């Protein structure tokens, strides 16, 4: 069986917030800030539109996409850091509001590596045989954990939400390989602090494990798939830093007219990251059936996951 | 192939709290609490034991039951709706504590149907011939998050964890047949309050829920499995109320010798719940090898599950 990206939506909110906002209160510039995270803007949801809402707009258009109607959805998969709450979950959320049956539906924790971790859980249910049509989203509103007098943070994160139908594809195409993996030692590096409910991170630590795991897992998932650097379309990787991400494509050997960037408008947007960048080379022509991409990103935890897909 | 629990685990803390305890804060009776809910006792972790020590606990156990080696396990999911933070999640806390390989973990939230969520999740992964020992843990320290100035849910909630190893068994054992469903119109009837950080429910409606689903969803995972209710040795259900329980059962037409009952001791644990009555019944040798169960939970969401396993 092949098993595959049947439909994909993405989604990130109306408010735009540029580099400059953050002279009104912070010691920064928008020359610091793009120096330091390649960042010009980013989106924050409005203050009555939470992670489940993000995850909606997402989900209505890949159902769309796919061509499907609600009620063809057999399960519901939602990786999200920042859910409206522990339960109802947004999963739980989606399966009123989109109108499906009442299906299995529960979200996964993994960060921002989640997406990843949702698609490859979809994989394994769609493989069984007993489920053909699983909504897998990613979404997170970052702003709602952001510590707006931490300069570090404060101009990091974004809101946003990405989402796809995981279900049977053509042949040759979908999910070629894949990889996850975590290392708890990292934990103390990037974490929400209990009793402030704040992101609180270290910075360099997490630099070094990014960049060097997103090359590595890279690698890897392309050569399970028996393939070099050569034949990857397309290098799609957690969007969390430019240069975390430019250190990243280096040590893959690919070359940058072959690497998405939306970090640039989006900022750092945890499990919304890909899809959304996804979306942008879709849009803008870059990305059609039978090209191959690879998936990458890294996360708190720590986490990491890698994917090689063959589109359409 | 024939997936099931190769080991089991299961930990309650150590602070026993009486019914006459709350008689100090509210307005309660031993009398009444046991009338409306059949709790007698139930388990608090200590202030600085959260729900990944509980995990941690119940994971060794499991590990040792199992006959393996921590390095053998390659992949964890932990099922809790009170995880210490959402990054890192106790799943990450257990792949360092553990001491096993960097291997996949997470946390995936569906309330007290957690714990059946996770089994089924392990399964898929294991069919897929990629895994073959993965740990699932139900925990939960439900302490956390109880409004002590609400009578009708301060003395419902205790804390505990459980964990299985989910692997090949021998032919005929393992996990018969099952099922999971949602559904979201009900998420306002059992809730987490997003600003106040409590639990909040409407005990008659999800009382109407619950009687209904456990009885439902075990009479369809019985039938899937081309067995009756007189196949079945034990029925073991979500402890959340006795009433509600024996309500199910009286539906169900089976003896009170046929279902676990453990919520007298340990309260409601949501995601533990189940896993604390097994190891309840394995102590008292109520249930070997070969025998025959049905586990039911449900919960907030609304969600529920449902399993049919051979034992050993």
């Known amino acids: 069986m092949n098993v595959g990206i049947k439909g994909?939506?993405?989604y990130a909110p109306e408010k735009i917030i540029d580099n400059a906002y953050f002279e009104q209160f912070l010691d920064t510039s928008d020359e610091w800030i793009s120096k330091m995270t390649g960042i010009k803007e980013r989106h924050w949801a409005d203050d009555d539109q939470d992670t489940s809402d993000l995850?909606?707009?997402?989900?209505?258009?890949?159902?769309?996409?796919?061509?499907?109607?609600?009620?063809?959805?057999?399960?519901?998969?939602?990786?999200?850091?920042?859910?409206?709450?522990?339960?109802?979950?947004?999963?739980?959320?989606?399966?009123?509001?989109?109108?499906?049956?009442?299906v299995a539906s529960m979200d996964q924790l993994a960060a921002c590596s989640g997406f990843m971790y949702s698609m490859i859980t979809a994989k394994q249910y769609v493989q069984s045989g007993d489920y053909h049509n699983i909504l897998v989203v990613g979404a997170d509103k970052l702003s709602k954990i952001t510590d707006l007098t931490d300069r570090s943070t404060a101009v990091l994160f974004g809101d946003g939400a990405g989402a796809v139908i995981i279900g049977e594809v053509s042949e040759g195409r979908g999910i070629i390989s894949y990889e996850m993996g975590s290392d708890g030692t990292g934990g103390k590096h990037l974490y929400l602090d209990k009793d402030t409910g704040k992101l609180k991170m270290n910075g360099r630590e997490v630099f070094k494990f990014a960049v060097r795991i997103m090359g590595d897992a890279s690698t890897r998932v392309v050569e399970k798939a028996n393939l070099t650097s050569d034949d990857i379309?397309?290098?799609?990787?957690?969007?969390?830093?430019?240069?975390?991400?430019?250190?990243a494509r280096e040590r893959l050997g690919i070359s940058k007219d072959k690497m998405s960037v939306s970090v640039n408008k989006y900022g750092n947007t945890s499990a919304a990251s890909i899809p959304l960048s996804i979306d942008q080379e879709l849009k803008n022509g870059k990305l059609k059936?039978?090209?191959?991409?690879?998936?990458?990103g890294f996360g708190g935890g720590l986490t990491w996951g890698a994917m090689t897909i063959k589109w359409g």
Chains 1, 2 share one sequence.
């Open 8 to 10: 994909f939506g993405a």
């Open 55 to 102: 995850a909606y707009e997402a989900s209505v258009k890949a159902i769309a996409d796919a061509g499907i109607q609600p009620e063809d959805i057999d399960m519901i998969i939602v990786a999200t850091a920042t859910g409206d709450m522990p339960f109802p979950t947004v999963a739980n959320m989606l399966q009123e509001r989109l109108g499906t049956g009442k």
């Open 233 to 247: 379309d397309l290098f799609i990787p957690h969007q969390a830093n430019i240069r975390i991400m430019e250190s």
């Open 289 to 296: 059936d039978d090209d191959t991409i690879v998936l990458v």
